[PDB]
Amino acid sequence: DSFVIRGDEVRQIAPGQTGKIADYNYKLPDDFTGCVIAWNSNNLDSKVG
Amino acid sequence: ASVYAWNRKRISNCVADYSVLYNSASFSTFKCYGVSPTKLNDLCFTNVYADSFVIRGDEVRQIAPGQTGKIADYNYKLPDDFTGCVIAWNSNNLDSKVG
Amino acid sequence: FQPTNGVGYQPYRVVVLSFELLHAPATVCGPKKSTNLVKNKCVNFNFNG
Amino acid sequence: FQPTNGVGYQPYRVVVLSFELLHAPATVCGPKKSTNLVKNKCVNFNFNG
């Protein structure tokens, strides 16, 4: 599952946390068996303006 | 190169298209002193010196005429009569590794 | 997104890998090399996980 | 530098272009294209800057 979020809401991508991404966008099960890989993409996903 | 060993390249005897620098949106800092930034194309210059280095984010404001700081005092000092532009962009992907 | 925005509001690309391991034959495995079959000896063994 | 550091402590690549305008002939000129020479008439001219 690949997507793009902001930095403070990376901590919401984990089993058992709350927030706008966890509630309304992407929810992880509590019995999740797997990994979460997050990296900064300021050069590719940001534009001046 | 690092800021203490900043790299100067001599640009001369060519046609310089400054529009490709200006229209592209990745340069977070584009500050010209003594020259209007949108009027770069019509002017002719004798020679151009391009000085390239890497600094952290709070040290970008010291690359300006008349400013002070560690980079201005010990690493890279611009003259008070400086004519030209400072073009700084984020390079977090290319110059940072985890650890 | 802007490149001047702070790391709390900077883009992060997130890939969430979910591994499911059922009572099914495994199709996703590592590149560990298959050795020759040595039988009739007391060996540690690893047959498809 | 670390990618998790805030934007004060993030890498920025800086190019300083310094133009010198002496009495020497100008060699670095922009992409403006030349026109034909018109003589004996009042014109508005740009002769090499």
From Swiss-Prot, chain A:
Instruction: Region Integrin-binding motif: list its residue ranges.
Output: 6-8
- The name this protein carries in UniProt is Spike protein S1
Function summary: Attaches the virion to the cell membrane by interacting with host receptor, initiating the infection. The major receptor is host ACE2. When S2/S2' has been cleaved, binding to the receptor triggers direct fusion at the cell membrane. When S2/S2' has not been cleaved, binding to the receptor results in internalization of the virus by endocytosis using host TFRC and GRM2 and leading to fusion of the virion membrane with the host endosomal membrane. Alternatively, may use NRP1/NRP2 and integrin as entry receptors.
Q: What does the annotation say about its assembly with partners? A: Binds to host ACE2. RBD also interacts with the N-linked glycan on 'Asn-90' of ACE2. Cleavage of S generates a polybasic C-terminal sequence on S1 that binds to host Neuropilin-1 (NRP1) and Neuropilin-2 (NRP2) receptors. Interacts with host integrin alpha-5/beta-1 (ITGA5:ITGB1) and with ACE2 in complex with integrin alpha-5/beta-1 (ITGA5:ITGB1). May interact via cytoplasmic c-terminus with M protein. May interact (via N-terminus) with host bilirubin and biliverdin, thereby preventing antibody binding to the SARS-CoV-2 spike NTD via an allosteric mechanism.
Q: Which lineage is the organism of this entry classified under, starting from the top rank?
A: Viruses, Riboviria, Orthornavirae, Pisuviricota, Pisoniviricetes
Give the source's domain of life in one word.
Answer: Viruses
This protein's gene is called S
Full-protein interval shown = 398 to 446 of 1273
